[PDB]
Amino acid sequence: AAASSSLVSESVVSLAAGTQAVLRCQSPRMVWTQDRLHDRQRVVHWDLSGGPGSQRRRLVDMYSAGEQRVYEPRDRDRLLLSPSAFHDGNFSLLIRAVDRGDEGVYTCNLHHHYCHLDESLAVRLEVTEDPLLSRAYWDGEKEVLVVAHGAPALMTCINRAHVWTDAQQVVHWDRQLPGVSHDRADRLLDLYASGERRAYGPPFLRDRVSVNTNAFARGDFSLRIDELERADEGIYSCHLHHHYCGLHERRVFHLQVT
């Protein structure tokens, strides 16, 4: 709803004059050719509330590779997920026949290991012996499912966002001179995944700054300053926005030249 997701890494760097500075900026999000299989690993798992005060229990999970997995041998074919869950975004859990051992607070949990996104939804399941009392209600914090004993139950969990169901990237380097605030940061470089570099600085610094473009393929956009003068003191920032993930990734370096 705003600058929605950021991964910020801040560091302090103090190096001697004349030494070479290496500001590491590497991320799986910075690998341009994104593997539709391994750079898109999602997982959904349904957990059941534990005992009085500890240790929730995992019931079933499934990765975007497929083939859902049940942990208890009693629930091997009575707890079912949609095999197409990651195609249409329907992560609902189906119980063939609920018993009183299924009562409790369920959570439907989503994890995007590549985008670092977590989602969780709570549904409480109540077992009644009078089938006329079956109902669902209240969403004041969560919805409650009153299910007749022995009957099948479908606990709904939907998320049709594109990140869960299935583009040139640019990495920017900024610098803040001592005394300058954050919003007055001057651009230093634009690094394109295909190798292009756009220089902004004054040639008094531009001579000693360099990057290794051959390492862009593995998502490495690190900065290198060779002959460290005191004029290099400042706050260096490496920022990237990943459109598919909706994610800002930012690395901050407080550089100091002794």
Tab-separated table of C-alpha atoms in Angstrom:
chain	number	residue	atom	x	y	z
A	1	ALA	CA	0.000	0.000	0.000
A	2	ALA	CA	3.185	2.099	0.154
A	3	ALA	CA	6.892	1.406	-0.147
A	4	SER	CA	5.700	-2.043	0.664
A	5	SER	CA	8.681	-4.343	1.201
A	6	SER	CA	12.324	-3.441	1.765
A	7	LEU	CA	15.398	-5.497	2.634
A	8	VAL	CA	17.921	-3.011	4.026
A	9	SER	CA	21.478	-3.921	5.028
A	10	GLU	CA	23.615	-1.279	6.737
A	11	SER	CA	27.347	-1.528	7.425
A	12	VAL	CA	30.259	0.574	8.662
A	13	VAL	CA	33.518	0.493	6.688
A	14	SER	CA	36.775	2.077	7.872
A	15	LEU	CA	39.801	1.668	5.600
A	16	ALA	CA	43.238	3.231	5.306
A	17	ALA	CA	44.072	5.832	2.681
A	18	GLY	CA	45.350	4.389	-0.585
A	19	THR	CA	43.749	1.023	0.188
A	20	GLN	CA	41.153	-0.460	-2.151
A	21	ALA	CA	37.542	-0.444	-0.955
A	22	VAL	CA	35.133	-3.239	-1.890
A	23	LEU	CA	31.449	-2.640	-1.095
A	24	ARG	CA	29.772	-6.001	-1.649
A	25	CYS	CA	26.312	-5.822	-3.240
A	26	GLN	CA	25.088	-9.284	-4.265
A	27	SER	CA	21.604	-10.802	-4.192
A	28	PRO	CA	19.628	-13.584	-5.901
A	29	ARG	CA	17.177	-10.857	-6.949
A	30	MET	CA	20.001	-9.328	-9.024
A	31	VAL	CA	20.350	-12.382	-11.292
A	32	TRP	CA	18.544	-11.173	-14.411
A	33	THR	CA	17.673	-14.472	-16.110
A	34	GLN	CA	15.392	-15.790	-13.370
A	35	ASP	CA	14.931	-19.562	-13.337
A	36	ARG	CA	11.180	-20.144	-13.549
A	37	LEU	CA	11.730	-23.238	-11.354
A	38	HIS	CA	14.385	-22.483	-8.724
A	39	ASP	CA	13.981	-18.693	-8.469
A	40	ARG	CA	10.220	-19.210	-7.994
A	41	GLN	CA	10.077	-21.653	-5.074
A	42	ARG	CA	6.896	-21.135	-3.053
A	43	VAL	CA	5.642	-23.279	-0.183
A	44	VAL	CA	2.272	-23.536	1.557
A	45	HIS	CA	1.799	-25.366	4.849
A	46	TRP	CA	-1.169	-25.800	7.186
A	47	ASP	CA	-0.398	-25.856	10.912
A	48	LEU	CA	-2.609	-26.814	13.848
A	49	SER	CA	-2.478	-25.067	17.217
A	50	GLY	CA	-0.485	-27.022	19.784
A	51	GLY	CA	-1.345	-27.956	23.337
A	52	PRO	CA	-1.852	-25.549	26.240
A	53	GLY	CA	1.105	-23.263	25.629
A	54	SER	CA	3.707	-24.454	23.135
A	55	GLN	CA	4.726	-26.144	19.892
A	56	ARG	CA	2.253	-25.790	17.016
A	57	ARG	CA	2.056	-28.887	14.781
A	58	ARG	CA	2.528	-28.979	11.005
A	59	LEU	CA	-0.065	-31.090	9.181
A	60	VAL	CA	0.669	-30.827	5.445
A	61	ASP	CA	2.822	-28.735	3.125
A	62	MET	CA	3.393	-28.461	-0.613
A	63	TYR	CA	6.041	-26.697	-2.682
A	64	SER	CA	5.403	-25.205	-6.112
A	65	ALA	CA	7.227	-28.277	-7.457
A	66	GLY	CA	4.116	-30.255	-6.466
A	67	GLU	CA	3.241	-33.448	-4.598
A	68	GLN	CA	1.817	-32.316	-1.255
A	69	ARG	CA	3.229	-34.056	1.832
A	70	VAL	CA	1.347	-35.170	4.956
A	71	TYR	CA	3.298	-35.718	8.172
A	72	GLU	CA	1.010	-37.965	10.195
A	73	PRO	CA	0.295	-41.435	8.726
A	74	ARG	CA	-3.292	-41.069	9.970
A	75	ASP	CA	-3.918	-38.080	7.664
A	76	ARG	CA	-2.335	-39.389	4.462
A	77	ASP	CA	-5.555	-39.299	2.403
A	78	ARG	CA	-7.909	-37.397	4.732
A	79	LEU	CA	-6.097	-34.034	4.487
A	80	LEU	CA	-6.059	-32.843	0.878
A	81	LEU	CA	-4.822	-29.736	-0.919
A	82	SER	CA	-5.557	-28.682	-4.477
A	83	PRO	CA	-2.780	-30.038	-6.741
A	84	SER	CA	-3.200	-26.849	-8.814
A	85	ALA	CA	-2.982	-24.563	-5.762
A	86	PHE	CA	-0.034	-22.557	-7.106
A	87	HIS	CA	-1.731	-22.131	-10.493
A	88	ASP	CA	-4.985	-20.472	-9.368
A	89	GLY	CA	-4.025	-19.428	-5.829
A	90	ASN	CA	-6.531	-21.644	-3.982
A	91	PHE	CA	-4.653	-22.966	-0.940
A	92	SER	CA	-7.743	-24.276	0.866
A	93	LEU	CA	-7.470	-27.414	2.999
A	94	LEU	CA	-10.002	-30.240	2.660
A	95	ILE	CA	-10.586	-32.727	5.483
A	96	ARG	CA	-12.515	-35.804	4.350
A	97	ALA	CA	-13.973	-36.565	7.791
A	98	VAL	CA	-13.345	-34.343	10.800
A	99	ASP	CA	-13.139	-35.875	14.256
A	100	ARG	CA	-12.779	-34.166	17.610
A	101	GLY	CA	-9.014	-34.543	17.175
A	102	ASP	CA	-9.175	-31.900	14.430
A	103	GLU	CA	-10.469	-29.119	16.688
A	104	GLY	CA	-8.212	-26.120	17.168
A	105	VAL	CA	-6.852	-23.027	15.420
A	106	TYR	CA	-5.487	-23.703	11.936
A	107	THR	CA	-3.097	-21.414	10.089
A	108	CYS	CA	-2.695	-21.284	6.318
A	109	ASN	CA	0.882	-20.151	5.715
A	110	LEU	CA	2.558	-19.022	2.488
A	111	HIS	CA	6.286	-18.452	1.986
A	112	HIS	CA	8.080	-17.100	-1.085
A	113	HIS	CA	11.696	-18.129	-0.546
A	114	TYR	CA	12.928	-16.002	-3.463
A	115	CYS	CA	10.930	-12.823	-2.724
A	116	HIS	CA	11.064	-13.177	1.100
A	117	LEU	CA	7.288	-12.853	1.503
A	118	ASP	CA	5.318	-14.441	4.343
A	119	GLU	CA	1.539	-14.729	4.620
A	120	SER	CA	-0.576	-16.364	7.308
A	121	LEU	CA	-4.327	-16.781	7.819
A	122	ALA	CA	-6.063	-18.193	10.897
A	123	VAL	CA	-9.182	-20.385	10.824
A	124	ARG	CA	-10.664	-21.998	13.938
A	125	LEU	CA	-12.369	-25.391	13.588
A	126	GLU	CA	-15.084	-26.442	16.041
A	127	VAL	CA	-16.683	-29.904	16.044
A	128	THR	CA	-20.359	-30.259	16.957
A	129	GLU	CA	-22.506	-33.374	17.281
A	130	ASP	CA	-25.742	-31.664	16.187
A	131	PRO	CA	-25.532	-31.199	12.387
A	132	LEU	CA	-28.146	-28.422	12.556
A	133	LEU	CA	-25.528	-26.259	14.329
A	134	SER	CA	-23.065	-26.185	11.411
A	135	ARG	CA	-22.139	-22.605	10.487
A	136	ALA	CA	-19.268	-20.158	9.929
A	137	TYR	CA	-18.954	-16.717	11.434
A	138	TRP	CA	-17.605	-13.472	12.852
A	139	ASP	CA	-14.201	-12.571	11.251
A	140	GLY	CA	-13.547	-10.139	14.110
A	141	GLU	CA	-10.083	-11.576	14.122
A	142	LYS	CA	-10.718	-14.763	12.156
A	143	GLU	CA	-13.496	-16.962	10.822
A	144	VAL	CA	-14.782	-19.963	12.777
A	145	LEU	CA	-16.006	-23.209	11.200
A	146	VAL	CA	-18.506	-25.262	13.203
A	147	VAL	CA	-18.520	-28.644	11.441
A	148	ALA	CA	-20.656	-31.676	12.236
A	149	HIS	CA	-18.668	-34.614	13.587
A	150	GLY	CA	-17.530	-36.954	10.826
A	151	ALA	CA	-18.411	-34.526	8.028
A	152	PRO	CA	-15.971	-33.144	5.446
A	153	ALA	CA	-14.769	-29.584	5.958
A	154	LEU	CA	-13.207	-27.061	3.569
A	155	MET	CA	-11.212	-24.292	5.251
A	156	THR	CA	-10.816	-21.517	2.696
A	157	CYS	CA	-7.446	-19.878	2.018
A	158	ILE	CA	-7.184	-17.774	-1.151
A	159	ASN	CA	-4.420	-15.535	-2.496
A	160	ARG	CA	-4.490	-14.859	-6.248
A	161	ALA	CA	-1.629	-12.337	-6.280
A	162	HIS	CA	0.738	-12.828	-9.202
A	163	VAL	CA	3.685	-13.604	-6.920
A	164	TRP	CA	1.959	-16.793	-5.705
A	165	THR	CA	0.504	-18.058	-9.006
A	166	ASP	CA	2.649	-17.032	-12.022
A	167	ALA	CA	11.759	-6.993	-17.633
A	168	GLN	CA	15.161	-5.280	-17.570
A	169	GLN	CA	16.637	-4.712	-14.111
A	170	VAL	CA	18.777	-1.770	-13.014
A	171	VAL	CA	20.984	-1.495	-9.925
A	172	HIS	CA	21.704	2.017	-8.650
A	173	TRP	CA	24.610	3.256	-6.535
A	174	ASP	CA	24.115	6.468	-4.547
A	175	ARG	CA	26.422	8.518	-2.333
A	176	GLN	CA	25.842	10.961	0.528
A	177	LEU	CA	28.616	13.398	1.368
A	178	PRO	CA	29.152	14.146	5.089
A	179	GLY	CA	26.467	16.604	6.180
A	180	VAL	CA	24.003	15.737	3.402
A	181	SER	CA	20.708	14.152	4.450
A	182	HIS	CA	19.268	10.994	2.895
A	183	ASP	CA	16.827	12.535	0.418
A	184	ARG	CA	19.627	14.651	-1.117
A	185	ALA	CA	21.684	11.617	-2.167
A	186	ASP	CA	23.399	11.952	-5.543
A	187	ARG	CA	23.378	9.055	-7.990
A	188	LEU	CA	26.775	7.468	-8.651
A	189	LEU	CA	26.131	4.707	-11.202
A	190	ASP	CA	23.372	2.914	-13.064
A	191	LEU	CA	24.316	-0.739	-13.614
A	192	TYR	CA	22.282	-2.666	-16.180
A	193	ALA	CA	22.213	-6.456	-16.106
A	194	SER	CA	23.298	-6.527	-19.763
A	195	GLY	CA	26.553	-4.716	-18.885
A	196	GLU	CA	25.867	-1.022	-19.502
A	197	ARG	CA	27.082	1.499	-16.925
A	198	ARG	CA	25.850	5.089	-16.646
A	199	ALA	CA	28.236	7.389	-14.766
A	200	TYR	CA	27.024	10.446	-12.843
A	201	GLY	CA	29.893	11.494	-10.600
A	202	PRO	CA	32.649	14.032	-11.137
A	203	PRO	CA	35.711	12.620	-12.949
A	204	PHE	CA	37.721	13.411	-9.797
A	205	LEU	CA	36.160	10.283	-8.255
A	206	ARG	CA	35.010	8.519	-11.445
A	207	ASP	CA	38.597	7.535	-12.290
A	208	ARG	CA	39.103	5.133	-9.366
A	209	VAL	CA	35.595	3.614	-9.135
A	210	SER	CA	34.972	0.379	-11.028
A	211	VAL	CA	32.724	-2.680	-11.232
A	212	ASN	CA	33.181	-6.180	-12.661
A	213	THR	CA	30.465	-6.473	-15.309
A	214	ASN	CA	31.234	-10.158	-15.933
A	215	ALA	CA	29.933	-10.841	-12.404
A	216	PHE	CA	26.508	-9.309	-13.123
A	217	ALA	CA	25.261	-12.692	-14.361
A	218	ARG	CA	25.518	-14.083	-10.817
A	219	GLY	CA	23.912	-10.980	-9.314
A	220	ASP	CA	27.121	-9.305	-8.087
A	221	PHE	CA	27.081	-5.516	-8.524
A	222	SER	CA	29.746	-4.642	-5.958
A	223	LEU	CA	31.532	-1.287	-6.063
A	224	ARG	CA	35.309	-0.835	-5.940
A	225	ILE	CA	37.270	2.309	-5.055
A	226	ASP	CA	41.003	1.952	-5.633
A	227	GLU	CA	42.966	4.909	-4.210
A	228	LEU	CA	41.010	5.933	-1.116
A	229	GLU	CA	41.219	9.671	-0.506
A	230	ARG	CA	39.445	11.418	2.351
A	231	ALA	CA	37.063	12.892	-0.252
A	232	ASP	CA	35.649	9.357	-0.586
A	233	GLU	CA	34.164	9.533	2.921
A	234	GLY	CA	30.407	9.220	2.693
A	235	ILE	CA	27.359	6.990	2.761
A	236	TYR	CA	27.304	4.690	-0.267
A	237	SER	CA	24.026	2.965	-1.119
A	238	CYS	CA	23.258	0.049	-3.443
A	239	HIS	CA	19.519	-0.152	-4.214
A	240	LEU	CA	17.405	-2.299	-6.553
A	241	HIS	CA	13.658	-2.639	-7.102
A	242	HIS	CA	12.420	-6.082	-8.165
A	243	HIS	CA	9.126	-5.696	-10.022
A	244	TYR	CA	7.942	-9.307	-9.749
A	245	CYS	CA	8.632	-9.475	-6.008
A	246	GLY	CA	7.445	-5.928	-5.331
A	247	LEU	CA	10.609	-5.625	-3.275
A	248	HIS	CA	13.171	-2.896	-2.692
A	249	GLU	CA	16.617	-4.253	-1.833
A	250	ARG	CA	19.076	-1.753	-0.381
A	251	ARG	CA	22.636	-2.012	0.973
A	252	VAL	CA	24.147	0.928	2.872
A	253	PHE	CA	27.872	1.488	3.490
A	254	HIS	CA	29.183	4.149	5.881
A	255	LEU	CA	32.678	4.530	4.433
A	256	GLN	CA	35.489	6.120	6.436
A	257	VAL	CA	39.040	6.765	5.220
A	258	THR	CA	41.593	6.998	8.030
